[PDB]
Amino acid sequence: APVCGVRASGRVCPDGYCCSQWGYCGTTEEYCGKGCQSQCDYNRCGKEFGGKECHDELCCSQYGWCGNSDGHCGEGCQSQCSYWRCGKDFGGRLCTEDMCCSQYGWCGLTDDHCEDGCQSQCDLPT
Amino acid sequence: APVCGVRASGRVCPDGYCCSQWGYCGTTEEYCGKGCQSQCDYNRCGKEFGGKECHDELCCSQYGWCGNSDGHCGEGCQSQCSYWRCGKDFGGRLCTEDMCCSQYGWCGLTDDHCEDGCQSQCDLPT
Secondary structure, three states: OOOOEHHHOOEOOHHHOEEOOOOOEEOOHHHHOOOOOEOOOOOEOEHHHOOEOOHHHOEEOOOOEEEOOHHHHOOOOOEOOOOOEOEHHHOOEOOOOOOEEOOOOEEEOOHHHHOOOOOEOOOOOO | OOOOEHHHOOEOOHHHOEEOOOOOEEOOHHHHOOOOOEOOOOOEOEHHHOOEOOHHHOEEOOOOEEEOOOOOOOOOOOEOOOOOEOEHHHOOEOOOOOOEEOOOOEEEOOHHHHOOOOOEOOOOOO
């Protein structure tokens, strides 16, 4: 049964999640896209959105979208643009998602990131 | 020794992957962003890229980036926009990654998608 929206006493979603047109909470297109009832800006950010920053330390694109693609963290990125950088050369920042910080200062979950020279969170099955 | 790039006699990565400044193959910002040596438009798509479609049936956002996160399959999507849809209203289409098809024709792994009304692949994760 619906947990949010017009079919749920106009209740909103916890943690700022989007309430889907069908009355469920989430952060994907189904919930935040067409038909979203409330808190539809969960994945939005930037100057055009009260200057809000993204959840999960994600980059804010020049179009006010949260994400970690080069389209979000690269040219035009508005905030939290150093999502993929880490280590001694970057204030000792630790990667999110427990990613390994490579010798070159890049977050990743591959062997070459967790192998020789890994700076932090080097745990990786092998 | 590097597997791609100038240090590999100009060899490019397989399957269109980006070659990083360090000579390795990947699809994230480390490989496709600044310093990328070749095949840097791996995640690009749309009108600005010869009408290219995305790999892994991902949606092409209005900004020409491949993905399935919020902002890629909704308004402005250029191609393969039905990534999250499934069910009888869609000819019986099944979800990828073994996701459940909800009663409303949306793919997901949450209880409401796999429970009452689920149309296919309702095997809740264990």
